[PDB]
Scaffold this active site. Sequence first.
Site, mmCIF file in Angstrom:
data_model
loop_
_atom_site.group_PDB
_atom_site.id
_atom_site.type_symbol
_atom_site.label_atom_id
_atom_site.label_comp_id
_atom_site.label_asym_id
_atom_site.label_seq_id
_atom_site.Cartn_x
_atom_site.Cartn_y
_atom_site.Cartn_z
ATOM 1 N N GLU A 189 -6.206 -8.659 4.531
ATOM 2 C CA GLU A 189 -6.638 -7.951 5.718
ATOM 3 C C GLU A 189 -7.479 -6.772 5.271
ATOM 4 O O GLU A 189 -6.937 -5.732 4.889
ATOM 5 C CB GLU A 189 -5.442 -7.434 6.529
ATOM 6 C CG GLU A 189 -5.861 -6.702 7.808
ATOM 7 C CD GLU A 189 -5.203 -5.337 7.964
ATOM 8 O OE1 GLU A 189 -5.536 -4.612 8.931
ATOM 9 O OE2 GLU A 189 -4.349 -4.993 7.119
ATOM 10 N N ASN A 192 0.784 -1.224 0.000
ATOM 11 C CA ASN A 192 0.000 0.000 0.000
ATOM 12 C C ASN A 192 0.822 1.284 0.000
ATOM 13 O O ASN A 192 0.425 2.288 -0.596
ATOM 14 C CB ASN A 192 -0.908 0.035 1.212
ATOM 15 C CG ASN A 192 -1.674 1.318 1.305
ATOM 16 O OD1 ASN A 192 -2.557 1.577 0.495
ATOM 17 N ND2 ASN A 192 -1.334 2.146 2.282
ATOM 18 N N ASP A 199 -1.528 -7.102 3.447
ATOM 19 C CA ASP A 199 -1.681 -5.953 4.326
ATOM 20 C C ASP A 199 -2.525 -4.800 3.777
ATOM 21 O O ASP A 199 -2.467 -4.487 2.591
ATOM 22 C CB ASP A 199 -0.280 -5.431 4.683
ATOM 23 C CG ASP A 199 -0.315 -4.309 5.686
ATOM 24 O OD1 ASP A 199 -0.789 -4.544 6.821
ATOM 25 O OD2 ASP A 199 0.135 -3.200 5.337
#
Length: 480
Positions: free
Chosen positions: A261, A104, A231
């Site tokens: 997640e 990210n 993530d």
Amino acid sequence: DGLNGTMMQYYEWHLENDGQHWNRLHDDAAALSDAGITAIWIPPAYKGNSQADVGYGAYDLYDLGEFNQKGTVRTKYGTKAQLERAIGSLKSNDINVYGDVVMNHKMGADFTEAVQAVQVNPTNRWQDISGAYTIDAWTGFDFSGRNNAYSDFKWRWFHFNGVDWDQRYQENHIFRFANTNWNWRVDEENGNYDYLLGSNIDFSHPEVQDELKDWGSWFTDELDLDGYRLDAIKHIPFWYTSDWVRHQRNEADQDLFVVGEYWKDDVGALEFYLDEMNWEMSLFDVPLHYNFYRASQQGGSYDMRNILRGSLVEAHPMHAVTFVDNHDTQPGESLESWVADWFKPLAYATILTREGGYPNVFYGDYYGIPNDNISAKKDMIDELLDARQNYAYGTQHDYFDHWDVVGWTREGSSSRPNSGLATIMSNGPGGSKWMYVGRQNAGQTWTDLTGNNGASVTINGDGWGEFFTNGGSVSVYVNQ
Ligand code: NA
Ligand code: NA
């Protein structure tokens, strides 16, 4: 085969920064397998902003604690060689390795760059609140100590689209680089939740899409991973994650399990994401976690009949990775919502003995969290793992019919001798309940694996048995 699958997140936020964690994992392999662990989720294994970084302040995805960067060679967990050595031990002990993947953002940029940006509304990244002006952003990555080993890709500001810190005037603001769009589609909390922290990666650029795909494959081949834990995927464009996933499965010969997640206490949101993913991965059951937390916080008044309600596992057990707590929910952390010790045993029985879901054990619970005087619950968990590993098989029968006492049974399966169990618990005064365990187990005498109840349950002729549990406790009877 046929053995149930049990995952384990091998780390907690306050682990010691002694660089010996990989070595510990290596030595713990045999014991983890024997206990019932079949898959290990390792923390981000690459160089972060600093040696002590837990791994999410990802600096260099190609530096697995092999080069001297960010003021250290090894990562918090150890060196690349110790990691590889650990994985080898895991493999030889029949344990799958899932690597944590942080794509990210990036942090720990080597140098700043002047960038035209605008401040946006923190609760509505769609709304600009300032005109465009020049800020200095930590966007330059040269990976000095690596010397282009594995990859000569360098990151610059034009690969990102935002930051939360203007180093020119030294101020905090959610900045969107002028003439760049927030990724899409992404979670819509705050309007557009593309930006979370650090320098936010813009996937609109082809060179970026390809770089992370190549890295993903390099990483996968380097560690011989059997899957990934993705993530902060709610902050990453849905379309890209799917592309990336499909790309990795395409490049890797081995099968790849994928768990993302998507942090939101809203199962609909999770189902939507899974829809976009075309159900090609599972997600951590975040709503179930919060159900555990809500119950932990409320006390006995909590109606246990709703414990699984709204959970992802309730709706799509084949796509849910169930867990009780993690490095973010433990005390003091960013998503703090800790399940107290009293309720934790009930929560673990729920994910380890039921048929639906891919259960995950939290290192912090298993070995304890010294930083916060939280005792290791290894004893309690090992008995639930023994249950799952050897007894949680066959047809399941649910009994969420009382506000305090609830339970379920597993008839067992001929494929695995003596399997079969009856889980009963109460989050208030104790009680009992008749439950069907399979007429084929008739005349059997079942005892509590947890040791919480001395009752000896004999199964009648109709395959039924009366099970007892004390107040605020849980018992798991089996034919031992
Ligand atoms: Na993002
Ligand atoms: Na209750």
